[PDB]
Amino acid sequence: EYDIRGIQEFLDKVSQQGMDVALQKVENNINKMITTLFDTMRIEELNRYRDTLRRAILVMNPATAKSFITEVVETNLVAFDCHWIIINEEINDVDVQE
Amino acid sequence: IGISALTITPDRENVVDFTTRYMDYSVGVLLRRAEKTVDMFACLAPFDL
Amino acid sequence: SLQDLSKQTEIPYGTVLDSAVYEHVRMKGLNPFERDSMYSQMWRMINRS
């Protein structure tokens, strides 16, 4: 439900410094999304994917973020070195804990 | 309200809200019992009665 | 237990379609970064045809 015009201003301020920004929508059917990767990518390419998730930004509804963090961690696509930032305007103290 | 053996999973929890869990989950298997037994007739088993 | 069962082939095995168990086994089986090597075996039996 995010309207990516709201980050139209990263473009001319990270293409300059030359970082490797990527987008990717997160579905409602998380498990279909994850399993399609294991079903379709080569085991060479997929090892260049875990190289990216060591950094991330999440911009989403916390009730989705909980389930996405749980699926990503549980499928072992990340390890003790990642540094996922999360941003929102509203997150109450029940969800910071979880 | 729904109530049964309904295991919590993130893709379900995304659209309905679960209480604290009241019993722990576990996968298992059911198999048929075999034979291998011993009896008085085992002395005579090589031939039909 | 379960670790041998993934290796024998004289007795076939399976589960209820579109249960949570079926999706659990599909999740573990495809994942190339699984540490175990039982789960990615079982899928090759269940998924026949």
Side-chain angles (χ1 to χ4, degrees):
Chain A
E1 309 318 292
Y2 192 52
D3 167 17
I4 68 169
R5 296 177 299 159
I7 63 177
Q8 186 173 32
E9 193 57 26
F10 87 91
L11 311 179
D12 196 21
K13 290 176 179 163
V14 187
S15 184
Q16 294 188 2
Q17 283 89 314
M19 315 182 190
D20 294 348
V21 178
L23 309 188
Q24 180 168 321
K25 186 168 68 182
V26 179
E27 290 293 330
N28 293 309
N29 188 344
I30 298 178
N31 199 280
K32 174 184 175 181
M33 174 179 66
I34 290 171
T35 53
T36 299
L37 305 183
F38 298 163
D39 194 38
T40 56
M41 293 192 178
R42 297 186 187 135
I43 305 299
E44 190 284 313
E45 294 170 303
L46 190 64
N47 272 283
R48 286 184 279 139
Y49 199 66
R50 289 175 70 248
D51 185 63
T52 292
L53 301 190
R54 281 182 153 70
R55 274 84 187 98
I57 303 184
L58 309 187
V59 183
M60 55 166 60
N61 175 15
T64 304
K66 295 180 184 184
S67 73
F68 181 64
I69 286 175
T70 305
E71 290 280 48
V72 160
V73 169
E74 201 267 330
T75 58
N76 194 45
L77 298 194
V78 298
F80 64 84
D81 54 353
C82 65
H83 183 201
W84 289 18
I85 293 176
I86 300 177
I87 187 165
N88 203 297
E89 291 203 322
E90 177 186 301
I91 312 180
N92 64 73
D93 299 347
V94 184
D95 296 333
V96 170
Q97 294 302 326
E98 276 209 80
Chain B
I1 291 95
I3 193 169
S4 186
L6 182 60
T7 295
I8 295 173
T9 59
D11 55 344
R12 290 176 172 163
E13 187 176 10
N14 192 33
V15 303
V16 295
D17 305 350
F18 290 103
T19 67
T20 305
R21 76 183 202 245
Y22 69 84
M23 176 165 68
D24 287 15
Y25 189 72
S26 171
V27 179
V29 192
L30 191 79
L31 300 99
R32 190 174 180 174
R33 283 181 186 254
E35 20 260 294
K36 298 152 246 357
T37 59
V38 174
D39 195 4
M40 173 276 283
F41 285 80
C43 318
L44 312 184
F47 300 149
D48 175 77
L49 311 184
Chain C
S1 153
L2 247 205
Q3 299 82 240
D4 303 343
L5 201 163
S6 71
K7 303 174 187 180
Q8 71 82 15
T9 65
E10 295 87 343
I11 303 100
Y13 50 90
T15 197
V16 182
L17 285 179
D18 295 340
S19 61
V21 168
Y22 182 73
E23 291 286 39
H24 177 73
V25 179
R26 191 165 68 135
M27 190 74 260
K28 302 303 180 180
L30 298 176
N31 185 349
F33 313 112
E34 184 45 70
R35 61 223 74 188
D36 176 51
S37 65
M38 168 171 72
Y39 280 92
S40 58
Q41 184 64 42
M42 289 203 203
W43 179 256
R44 185 159 53 193
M45 176 56 76
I46 295 187
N47 197 41
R48 287 187 180 181
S49 306

